[PDB]
Every structure is written in C-alpha cells, then in structure tokens.
Amino acid sequence: MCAVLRQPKCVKLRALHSACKFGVAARSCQELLRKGCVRFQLPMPGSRLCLYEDGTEVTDDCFPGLPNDAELLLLTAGETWHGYVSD
C-alpha cells in the first residue's frame, strides 16, 4: 500500500518563443507541469505544447507520467515545432 516517491522527476521546459528552457525537477510530476504552464504561461486555448523528443505534440493538461527529464516545448497557434529527427 502507499506509494512514496524515492526519486524526483525532472522535465526540460524549452520554449520556441524564447531563447532557452527551464529544467524543473519535482517529486510529483504534476508540480513540474503546473509550474511549467506558469513560468511559461501556456493557456489551453490559442496555445499548445509539443514533446521535443521527436516533434510530438501534447498539452500541459495531457501529460500523465512524463518520462525522466521529459522534453516539453512551449507553442501556440502563432508558433510550431518541426521535430528532433534526421529526415
């Protein structure tokens, strides 16, 4: 029973509308997301996020258990991210 977290999760919050990212770490991955949409300010409407792993697309509310150092990028209808592949 129970479920203590013996390992904080980290996520790189990069932003295409900026010049860098924000490697934020936190035990409850839910904390990294919220604080993520905050320092980056990403509203659900007229906005959108995407995984920088290979150009995937996701939102700050659709991130269940992101992987370690989850790569997230800020984006919006006025922005877009191709992907991190070689094709």
PDB file of C-alpha atoms in Angstrom:
ATOM      1  CA  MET A   1       0.000   0.000   0.000  1.00  0.00           C
ATOM      2  CA  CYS A   2       1.066   3.672  -0.016  1.00  0.00           C
ATOM      3  CA  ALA A   3       3.499   4.924  -2.684  1.00  0.00           C
ATOM      4  CA  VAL A   4       6.325   7.216  -1.518  1.00  0.00           C
ATOM      5  CA  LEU A   5       8.394   8.772  -4.331  1.00  0.00           C
ATOM      6  CA  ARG A   6      12.066   7.859  -3.791  1.00  0.00           C
ATOM      7  CA  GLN A   7      13.141   9.867  -6.862  1.00  0.00           C
ATOM      8  CA  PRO A   8      12.236  13.361  -8.082  1.00  0.00           C
ATOM      9  CA  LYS A   9      11.236  13.621 -11.768  1.00  0.00           C
ATOM     10  CA  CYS A  10      12.822  16.307 -13.981  1.00  0.00           C
ATOM     11  CA  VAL A  11      11.462  17.908 -17.176  1.00  0.00           C
ATOM     12  CA  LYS A  12      13.201  20.345 -19.554  1.00  0.00           C
ATOM     13  CA  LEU A  13      10.684  23.132 -20.263  1.00  0.00           C
ATOM     14  CA  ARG A  14      12.050  24.607 -23.515  1.00  0.00           C
ATOM     15  CA  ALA A  15      10.200  27.392 -25.372  1.00  0.00           C
ATOM     16  CA  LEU A  16      10.293  28.233 -29.100  1.00  0.00           C
ATOM     17  CA  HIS A  17       9.140  31.792 -28.318  1.00  0.00           C
ATOM     18  CA  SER A  18      12.207  32.222 -26.076  1.00  0.00           C
ATOM     19  CA  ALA A  19      15.962  31.534 -26.169  1.00  0.00           C
ATOM     20  CA  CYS A  20      16.338  28.603 -23.737  1.00  0.00           C
ATOM     21  CA  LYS A  21      14.429  26.200 -21.457  1.00  0.00           C
ATOM     22  CA  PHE A  22      13.846  25.537 -17.738  1.00  0.00           C
ATOM     23  CA  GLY A  23      14.972  22.166 -16.338  1.00  0.00           C
ATOM     24  CA  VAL A  24      12.481  21.998 -13.448  1.00  0.00           C
ATOM     25  CA  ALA A  25      12.512  18.959 -11.124  1.00  0.00           C
ATOM     26  CA  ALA A  26       9.842  17.851  -8.619  1.00  0.00           C
ATOM     27  CA  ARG A  27       8.639  14.663  -6.880  1.00  0.00           C
ATOM     28  CA  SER A  28       5.024  14.969  -8.075  1.00  0.00           C
ATOM     29  CA  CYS A  29       5.411  15.299 -11.867  1.00  0.00           C
ATOM     30  CA  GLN A  30       2.101  17.191 -11.595  1.00  0.00           C
ATOM     31  CA  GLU A  31       4.079  20.002  -9.930  1.00  0.00           C
ATOM     32  CA  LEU A  32       6.551  20.327 -12.819  1.00  0.00           C
ATOM     33  CA  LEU A  33       3.661  20.660 -15.296  1.00  0.00           C
ATOM     34  CA  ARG A  34       1.632  23.289 -13.404  1.00  0.00           C
ATOM     35  CA  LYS A  35       4.678  25.402 -12.507  1.00  0.00           C
ATOM     36  CA  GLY A  36       5.623  24.767 -16.151  1.00  0.00           C
ATOM     37  CA  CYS A  37       2.477  26.344 -17.645  1.00  0.00           C
ATOM     38  CA  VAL A  38       3.110  29.170 -15.148  1.00  0.00           C
ATOM     39  CA  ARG A  39       6.681  30.395 -15.757  1.00  0.00           C
ATOM     40  CA  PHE A  40       5.907  29.780 -19.452  1.00  0.00           C
ATOM     41  CA  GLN A  41       2.258  30.914 -19.333  1.00  0.00           C
ATOM     42  CA  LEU A  42       0.503  28.464 -21.686  1.00  0.00           C
ATOM     43  CA  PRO A  43      -3.282  28.744 -21.893  1.00  0.00           C
ATOM     44  CA  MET A  44      -5.280  25.792 -23.277  1.00  0.00           C
ATOM     45  CA  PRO A  45      -6.969  27.853 -25.993  1.00  0.00           C
ATOM     46  CA  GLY A  46      -4.903  29.725 -28.612  1.00  0.00           C
ATOM     47  CA  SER A  47      -1.897  27.677 -27.437  1.00  0.00           C
ATOM     48  CA  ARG A  48      -0.320  24.194 -27.478  1.00  0.00           C
ATOM     49  CA  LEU A  49       2.780  22.271 -26.344  1.00  0.00           C
ATOM     50  CA  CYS A  50       4.862  19.557 -28.049  1.00  0.00           C
ATOM     51  CA  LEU A  51       7.431  16.939 -26.988  1.00  0.00           C
ATOM     52  CA  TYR A  52      10.911  17.942 -28.223  1.00  0.00           C
ATOM     53  CA  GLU A  53      11.920  14.252 -28.263  1.00  0.00           C
ATOM     54  CA  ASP A  54      10.977  13.912 -31.952  1.00  0.00           C
ATOM     55  CA  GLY A  55       8.445  16.691 -32.631  1.00  0.00           C
ATOM     56  CA  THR A  56       5.493  15.113 -30.787  1.00  0.00           C
ATOM     57  CA  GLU A  57       2.506  17.292 -29.798  1.00  0.00           C
ATOM     58  CA  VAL A  58       0.972  17.431 -26.300  1.00  0.00           C
ATOM     59  CA  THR A  59      -0.585  19.863 -23.786  1.00  0.00           C
ATOM     60  CA  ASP A  60       0.193  20.808 -20.167  1.00  0.00           C
ATOM     61  CA  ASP A  61      -3.042  19.003 -19.217  1.00  0.00           C
ATOM     62  CA  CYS A  62      -2.383  15.840 -21.263  1.00  0.00           C
ATOM     63  CA  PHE A  63       0.910  14.962 -19.521  1.00  0.00           C
ATOM     64  CA  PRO A  64       0.251  11.984 -17.237  1.00  0.00           C
ATOM     65  CA  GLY A  65       3.576  10.449 -16.123  1.00  0.00           C
ATOM     66  CA  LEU A  66       6.123  12.184 -18.385  1.00  0.00           C
ATOM     67  CA  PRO A  67       9.424  10.331 -18.716  1.00  0.00           C
ATOM     68  CA  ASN A  68      12.534  11.460 -16.802  1.00  0.00           C
ATOM     69  CA  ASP A  69      13.802  14.857 -17.996  1.00  0.00           C
ATOM     70  CA  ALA A  70      10.599  14.938 -20.060  1.00  0.00           C
ATOM     71  CA  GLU A  71      11.313  17.252 -23.018  1.00  0.00           C
ATOM     72  CA  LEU A  72       8.451  19.765 -23.356  1.00  0.00           C
ATOM     73  CA  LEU A  73       8.309  22.823 -25.650  1.00  0.00           C
ATOM     74  CA  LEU A  74       6.003  25.867 -25.438  1.00  0.00           C
ATOM     75  CA  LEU A  75       3.986  26.568 -28.608  1.00  0.00           C
ATOM     76  CA  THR A  76       0.796  28.324 -29.763  1.00  0.00           C
ATOM     77  CA  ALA A  77      -1.329  28.909 -32.887  1.00  0.00           C
ATOM     78  CA  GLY A  78       1.279  31.576 -33.699  1.00  0.00           C
ATOM     79  CA  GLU A  79       4.116  29.031 -33.379  1.00  0.00           C
ATOM     80  CA  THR A  80       5.090  25.486 -34.444  1.00  0.00           C
ATOM     81  CA  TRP A  81       7.856  22.901 -33.879  1.00  0.00           C
ATOM     82  CA  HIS A  82       9.077  20.522 -36.617  1.00  0.00           C
ATOM     83  CA  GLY A  83      10.758  17.767 -34.565  1.00  0.00           C
ATOM     84  CA  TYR A  84      14.130  16.391 -33.404  1.00  0.00           C
ATOM     85  CA  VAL A  85      14.770  13.748 -36.095  1.00  0.00           C
ATOM     86  CA  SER A  86      17.110  13.429 -39.105  1.00  0.00           C
ATOM     87  CA  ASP A  87      14.644  13.331 -42.024  1.00  0.00           C
TER      88      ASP A  87
END
